[PDB]
Amino acid sequence: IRASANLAATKMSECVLGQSKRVDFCGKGYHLMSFPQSAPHGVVFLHVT
Amino acid sequence: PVSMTKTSVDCTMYICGDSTECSNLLLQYGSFCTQLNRALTGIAVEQDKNTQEVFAQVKQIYKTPPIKDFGGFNFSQILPDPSKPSKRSFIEDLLFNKVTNGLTVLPPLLTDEMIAQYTSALLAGTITSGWTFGAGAALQIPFAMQMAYRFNGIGVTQNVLYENQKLIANQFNSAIGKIQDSLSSTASALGKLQDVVNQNAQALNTLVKQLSSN
Amino acid sequence: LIANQFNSAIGKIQDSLSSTASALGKLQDVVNQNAQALNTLVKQLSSNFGAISSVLNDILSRLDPPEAEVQIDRLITGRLQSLQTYVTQQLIRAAEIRASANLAATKMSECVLGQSKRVDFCGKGYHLMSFPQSAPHGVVFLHVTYVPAQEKNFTTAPAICHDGKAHFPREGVFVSNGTHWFVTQRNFYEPQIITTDNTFVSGNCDVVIGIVNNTVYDPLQPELDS
Amino acid sequence: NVFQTRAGCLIGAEHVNNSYECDIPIGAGICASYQTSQSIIAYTMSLGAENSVAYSNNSIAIPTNFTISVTTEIL
Numbered sequence: 012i013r014a015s016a017n018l019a020a021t022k023m024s025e026c027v028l029g030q031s032k033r034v035d036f037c038g039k040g041y042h043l044m045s046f047p048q049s050a051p052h053g054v055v056f057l058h059v060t
Numbered sequence: 061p062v063s064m065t066k067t068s069v070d071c072t073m074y075i076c077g078d079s080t081e082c083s084n085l086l087l088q089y090g091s092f093c094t095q096l097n098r099a100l101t102g103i104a105v106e107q108d109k110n111t112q113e114v115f116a117q118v119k120q121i122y123k124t125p126p127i128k129d130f131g132g133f134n135f136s137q138i139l140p141d142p143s144k145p146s147k148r149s150f151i152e153d154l155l156f157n158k159v160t161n162g163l164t165v166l167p168p169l170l171t172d173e174m175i176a177q178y179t180s181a182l183l184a185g186t187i188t189s190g191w192t193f194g195a196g197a198a199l200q201i202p203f204a205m206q207m208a209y210r211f212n213g214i215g216v217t218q219n220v221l222y223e224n225q226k227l228i229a230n231q232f233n234s235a236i237g238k239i240q241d242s243l244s245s246t247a248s249a250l251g252k253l254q255d256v257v258n259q260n261a262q263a264l265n266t267l268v269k270q271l272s273s274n
Numbered sequence: 275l276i277a278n279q280f281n282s283a284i285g286k287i288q289d290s291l292s293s294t295a296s297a298l299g300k301l302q303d304v305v306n307q308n309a310q311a312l313n314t315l316v317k318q319l320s321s322n323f324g325a326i327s328s329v330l331n332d333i334l335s336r337l338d339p340p341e342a343e344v345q346i347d348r349l350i351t352g353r354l355q356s357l358q359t360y361v362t363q364q365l366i367r368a369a370e371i372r373a374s375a376n377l378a379a380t381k382m383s384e385c386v387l388g389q390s391k392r393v394d395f396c397g398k399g400y401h402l403m404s405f406p407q408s409a410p411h412g413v414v415f416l417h418v419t420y421v422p423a424q425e426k427n428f429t430t431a432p433a434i435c436h437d438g439k440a441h442f443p444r445e446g447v448f449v450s451n452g453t454h455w456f457v458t459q460r461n462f463y464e465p466q467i468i469t470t471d472n473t474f475v476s477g478n479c480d481v482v483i484g485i486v487n488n489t490v491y492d493p494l495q496p497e498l499d500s
Numbered sequence: 501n502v503f504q505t506r507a508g509c510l511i512g513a514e515h516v517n518n519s520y521e522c523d524i525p526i527g528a529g530i531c532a533s534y535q536t537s538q539s540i541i542a543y544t545m546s547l548g549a550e551n552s553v554a555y556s557n558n559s560i561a562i563p564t565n566f567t568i569s570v571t572t573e574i575l
Contacts, residue, residue, distance in 0.1 A: 012256070014373070015061050016110040021395070023114055027182060028194030029393035030213050041214040043207070044186060046138055049148070049172065049179045050155045053062045053253040054114055057138070057239070059232070089352070090321035091314055095359070098310075108525070117394070120551040129557055131483070167507050167527045170545075174529050177547060188555045195399045196421045199561040200553045204483065205432055205447065209460075218442050219476035222432055225483055276568060283570040290572070300574050378575040397571040415573045422563030430560040449560060463564040484558065 019054055023047060026056065061256045063111050066104040066166040067264070071096050074162040108169040115170075115178040122184035122198060131204035132229030135187065137236050140180045148176045149183075154243050158250050159257070163264065280418070287416070301412045307367065315360045323352030378413055382406060385415065422461060431455075434468070435479035436490040444472050455488050467491050503542060505530050510542060519546035 026037045026045045037045060038058030048055045071093035076082030086093070124139065140149050148156075156172075189198035190206045204225065208218040221228070243249055291297055320328050325348040327333050333345050385396045385404045396404055397417030405416040428449040433440050446459040448468070456465030457472045466472060469491040479485050503510040507527025522545045523533035532542040 012061055012064055013106065013110060013370075016063070016114060017373075017377075019062055020113045020117075021392075023117060023182070024194070024394040025392045027186060028117070029191045029391075030210055031392065032213070033392075043210050043214070044191075046183050046186060047179050048138065048152050048155065049175045050152070050250075051159045051172075051253060052064070052256060055155065057236075059235075085324075088322050088324055090318050090356075092359075095314060099363075116547075120548045122551050122553060125552065125555045127555075131557075169525050169527065169529070171529050174545070174547065184553075188553045191393070192422070194393050196423070196563075197425060198551070198553050199422075199425060199563070200555045201560045202430065202432070202484075202555075202557050204557075205430070205560070208432065217476075219474075222442075222482040223477055279568040280570075283568055287570060287572065297572060298574065374575055381573075381575070397569075397573060399569065402568075409574065413575055415575075417571050417573060419569050419571065421567045421569055423567045424565040425561045425563050427554070428560050428562055429558060431558065447560065447562075449562065458562065461563065462566065463562045 022056060023054070026058065061253055062114055063107045063168065064103075064256060065260055066107045066168060067260070068100050068104060068164050068166060069096070069267075070162045070164070077162070104166055111168065111170055111175070115175060118178065118181050118185060118193065120198075121177055121181040122188070122193070123180065124184050124187060130187065131202070131207075132226055132233070133203065134233045134236075137240065138183060140176065146176075147173060147180075149180075151239060151243070152176065152179075154240065155250070158243065158247060159254055161268075163267075283418070284416075298409075301409060304367075304371070305411065311360060311363060315356065318353065318356040321352065324348050325352075381415065382413070385417070426463065431484060431486040433482045433485045434488045434490070435485050436488060438478045439475045440477050440479055440482055440485055441468075441473040441490050442476060444474060446472070455486075469493060513540040513542040516541045516543040519544050521546055 022037070022045075025031045025033070026042065027047055030044060031037055031042055034041075036042075038060045040060035043059045045056050045058045048057065072083060072086070076086055128135065128139075137150050140147055141153075144153070146153075185193035185198055187203065188200055190201045190209065192199045192201075204222070207228070208221045211218060211221050295302075322328050325333065325345045327336075327345075328349075330346070330349065333349075334342060337345065381395070384390045384392070385401065386406055389403065390396050390401055393400075395401070397419045399419040399421040402418045402420050404418060407414045407416065429452065430450070431448050433442050434448060434455065435441060443457050446457050448455060448457055449463075449465070450456065451465075454465075455468055457468045458465045468488070470493065473490060479487075501512070501514075503513060503515045505526060505528060507530065510526070510530075510532075513532055520531075520533065520543060522531035525531050526542065529545040530542055531545050532540060534540050
């Protein structure tokens with residue numbers, strides 16, 4: 012899980028707080044921004060591409 | 061997936077439930093109780109450094125202004141609901157519905173009530189203060205512009221945005237709409253999280269069922 | 275000014291490290307764990323596991339072999355279990371450290387030998403550079419980050435038009451101190467006269483939302499005027 | 501003198517209407533700390549100051565001076 016946690020943590024940092032250029036790291040396509048949403052034991056992002 | 065369930069187990073009563081004669085013998089085996097109770101507790105605390113790191117990444121809990129004139133974009137789906145008793149957002153509510161001794165279960169450090177606040181905050185910083193609020197003090201900036209910024213981020217000049225604003229809005233506003241329906245019908249779209257809970261209960265049942273073998 | 279801040283910045287680190295111990299929690303942690311791992315392993319040797327003693331040389335000195343194997347086997351299956359528990363623990367913890375290691379290496383590569391833009395991958399704020407330092411069983415970075423400080427409200431506008439043609443900025447945004455209009459770069463206020471070097475024509479006024487009437491300066495006309 | 505949590509029963513600490521950062525975690529967002537004459541208090545976790553940004557369809561905020569900083573990070 013912690014591997015997923017860090018992977019999540021990175022995404023919430025890179026993919027939400029800013030805007031990344033790592034292709035296919037924020038949903039298929041050029042990334043625009045991304046909002047998060049809570050979930051039981053987990054997180055759900057909305058990559059806007 | 062972000063965190064498991066902070067489980068824990070009394071070794072002593074699980075092995076030798078309410079019998080000194082049994083508990084006497086276990087005393088021969090040294091510290092296997094000591095490790096395991098330390099071992100699981102080691103897991104438990106980590107199950108909160110986890111959540112603390114994914115969510116608690118913005119210093120100040122922001123919050124949107126009352127108006128919602130974001131160039132034409134209708135965020136009513138993802139912003140929190142004041143009318144609804146729970147301080148959550150609409151799409152979140154779908155997610156909650158979509159996911160279903162000697163063994164204590166320590167409740168998570170943060171609650172769904174609080175977790176929703178951070179995801180309210182981040183969703184407020186991004187919506188209003190662009191991407192600056194991650195770097196430093198939040199700076200308001202008209203949301204239309206923020207797109208125009210973010211287009212330069214992908215090598216597309218500002219002019220296409222403004223000249224296509226309303227057209228984008230409907231595309232964007234529509235795009236959210238499919239999420240509700242996509243999640244509403246496809247119950248199995250959350251196989252990942254649902255699996256995590258299922259796996260853990262899987263083990264616990266196996267753990268309990270072992271007692272009935274001689 | 276930047277020099278003093280940087281020099282001042284370093285100085286506080288010394289204090290931030292000289293007094294408080296909590297900064298090195300992570301390294302001081304992993305050392306502690308292995309100590310328990312060892313001690314717990316060592317302490318096991320005194321457990322009897324059901325045999326009549328804990329000293330292997332004693333149990334031999336007191337019994338002839340044929341029933342000793344009844345006793346000694348009880349120890350063997352005891353301790354032998356105790357290792358592989360310890361080993362598996364070490365194996366499990368081994369992976370975690372490497373996961374930290376590879377993260378460190380990358381966090382050395384992308385953050386020292388270069389300059390990343392992955393926000394919060396090199397400390398809070400925009401990242402400038404970073405210096406590493408040695409540390410017992412670990413590495414300590416020093417991210418040096420730029421952070422905007424003093425801010426001001428301004429009345430903006432996404433676009434301005436002057437001859438019907440709409441003008442957009444090249445780099446930066448449009449702000450107004452209330453009376454005049456200026457284009458300025460987008461991370462440090464520095465008002466420049468709005469001119470055709472800063473802009474580029476596209477379309478015309480009535481399509482973009484929120485455009486404002488104004489006048490764009492031309493460098494050439496005064497030159498032509500002479 | 502006895503407080504009740506969605507996580508369990510607490511004895512010897514005082515519930516407080518205030519809010520602070522979490523010195524020692526308990527559960528369900530209750531955290532305990534030692535403080536003012538002094539005793540142990542337990543309370544709802546705080547999540548930093550509530551802040552509102554003055555958004556408006558035509559308003560922007562631009563920095564005019566900047567701070568370098570140096571932050572440790574250990575691995």
